[PDB]
């Protein structure tokens, strides 16, 4: 039911894991601009619906932690 990064209701399977549409596009836009996200804190920001925008670094590390990857979407559009 819930996005694995930010805990809002999931929308589907994107880049291998169950996510909302918002984290789908964050991650898409992150790997396309290869952004230098750094965390001003101690890498322990809460990532939830209200706070996810506060620290793209910490939200980025969560997608990785939850196992998103560009490898999944490439292969899934080739299988199709
Ligand atoms: Zn999310
Ligand atoms: Zn942070």
Specify the CATH number for the domain of residue 42: 3.30.50.10
Ligand 1 is an ion; its neighbours by CB within 5 Å are 3, 5-6, 20, 23
Helix-strand-coil split of the chain, %, nearest 5: 45, 10, 45
This structure's resolution (angstroms)? 2.5
CA atoms of 66 and 79, how far apart (whole Å): 23
* 9 backbone dihedrals φ, ψ, rounded to 5°: -60, 130
Rounded to 10 degrees, the C-alpha dihedral 56/61/65/71 comes to 80
| 70 CA distance to ligand 1 middle (Å) | 17
Q: Which ligand is nearest to the CA of 24?
A: 1
Give strand pairing partners of 2.
9
Domain carrying residue 11: 1-80
Domain count, the chain: 1
């Amino acid at each position: 039911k819930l996005c694995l990064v930010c805990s809002d209701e999931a929308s589907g399977c994107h880049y291998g894991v169950l996510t909302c549409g918002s984290c789908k596009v964050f991650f898409k836009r992150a790997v396309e601009g290869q952004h230098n996200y750094l965390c001003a804190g101690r890498n322990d920001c809460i990532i939830d619906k209200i706070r996810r925008k506060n620290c793209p670094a910490c939200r980025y590390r969560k997608c990785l932690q939850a196992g998103m990857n560009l490898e999944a979407r490439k292969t899934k559009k080739k299988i199709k």
